[PDB]
């Protein structure tokens, strides 16, 4: 639509709190309109193409004169949910993105399990990571590769995800918009092009170092993934962080079910005691030798509001740091703090403080550096 300038893309994301950020897209001729989840954690573009009780609409191939069948089926399992369907290609646009149309690979989802989310209001997923993790294999070009190859759009995008039961945010395809952040952009390298893999080199909780061998933080990888809710941490790191949070906030008496995300903590509306809870800092590898920077999130990011489970008299929350056995996942808990620039052209990810992050009058999310890391240990997990 129209000029595709950055001002037209600001605020092009919507969602329900806790159910994913999506952008509007059109597929097929004539255009069929669907809300598509923005997922930096995977690389397949896939839309519902069959009735499903959670879907209010879906893509109908037979209606599109520009659809082509690739006669190959496909199966994707994620950490949460799975789906299968048929590969094909079709014309695709983004009404509040660039002003372009691209022929892209589409998976028509015909069966799924625990994938679609009731009331989330989206009907597909946009995998924005690289080919290497696309199913069935890396020869299925992801959408972002197609868009850059076929158009003039610069090889970057950036995301501003805004926390809380409606959320919003922006995907700027092709550049950086100055009104979505304040302060400076700090960049960490993309270690390998598959997931948007990065290296964490130090973790602090309330300024106190977790004091683990830095390889533990990236065992067996660390990714930035807009399709995952939580900050997911490898088991050993999960355990230490909970301990450290529990101590800093004297919540040793909270049930351990709260800490495994099996129960909500509820306070009188307007009284959440933000300040008993510690800020969390990740130091990320810098762009020069032995330099790093940190990102810092508040409890306002790692405690997430949950609605319609209890009286409006009360705010209730879920602990949204959880355990993983497949590496760190810097999910929405992390991304809601910052403006995040996915600078594929220069193999780097940028963080700046988000103009829209939830904070209080005492504390804000921060992005700070440079720090000289006296340690020349290689923090990446290798074997």
């Amino acid at each position: 639509g129209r000029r595709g300038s950055f001002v037209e893309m600001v605020d092009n994301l919507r969602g329900k709190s806790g159910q994913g950020y999506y952008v509007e897209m059109t597929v097929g001729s004539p255009p069929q309109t669907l809300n598509i989840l923005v997922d930096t954690g995977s690389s397949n573009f896939a839309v519902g193409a069959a009735p499903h009780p959670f879907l209010h609409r879906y893509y109908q191939r037979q209606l599109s004169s520009t659809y082509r069948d690739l006669r190959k089926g496909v199966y994707v399992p994620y950490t949460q949910g799975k789906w299968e369907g048929e590969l094909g290609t079709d014309l695709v646009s983004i009404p509040h993105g660039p002003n372009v149309t691209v022929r892209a690979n589409i998976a028509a989802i015909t069966e799924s399990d625990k994938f679609f989310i009731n009331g989330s209001n989206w009907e597909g997923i946009l995998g924005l990571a690289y080919a290497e993790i696309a199913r069935p294999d890396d020869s299925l070009e992801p959408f972002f590769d197609s868009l850059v190859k076929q158009t003039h759009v610069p090889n970057l995008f950036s995301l501003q995800l805004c926390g809380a039961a409606s959320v919003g945010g922006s995907m700027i395809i092709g550049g950086i918009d100055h009104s979505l952040y304040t302060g400076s952009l700090w960049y960490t390298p993309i270690r390998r092009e598959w997931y948007y893999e990065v290296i964490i080199v130090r973790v602090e909780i309330n300024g106190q170092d977790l004091k683990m061998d830095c390889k533990e933080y990236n065992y067996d990888k660390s990714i930035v993934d807009s399709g995952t809710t939580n900050l997911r941490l490898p088991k050993k790191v999960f355990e230490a962080a909970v301990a450290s949070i529990k101590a800093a906030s004297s919540t040793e008496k909270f049930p351990d079910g709260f800490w495994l995300g099996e129960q909500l903590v509820c306070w009188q509306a307007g009284t959440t005691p933000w300040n008993i809870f510690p800020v969390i800092s990740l130091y990320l590898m810098g762009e020069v030798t032995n330099q790093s920077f940190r990102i810092t999130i508040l409890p306002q990011q790692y405690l997430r509001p949950v609605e319609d489970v209890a009286t409006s008299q009360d705010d209730c929350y879920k602990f949204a740091i959880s355990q993983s056995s497949t590496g760190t996942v810097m999910g929405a808990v992390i991304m809601e703090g910052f403006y995040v620039v996915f600078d594929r052209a220069r193999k780097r990810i940028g963080f700046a403080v988000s103009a829209c992050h939830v904070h209080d009058e005492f504390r804000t999310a921060a992005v700070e550096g440079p720090f000289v890391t006296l340690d020349m240990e290689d923090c990446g997990y290798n074997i």
Binding site: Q263, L264, C266, V306
Partner: peptide
């Protein structure tokens, strides 16, 4: 009033 309290999910 009793706070905080906990709810299952």
């Amino acid at each position: 009033a009793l706070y905080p309290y906990f709810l299952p999910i």
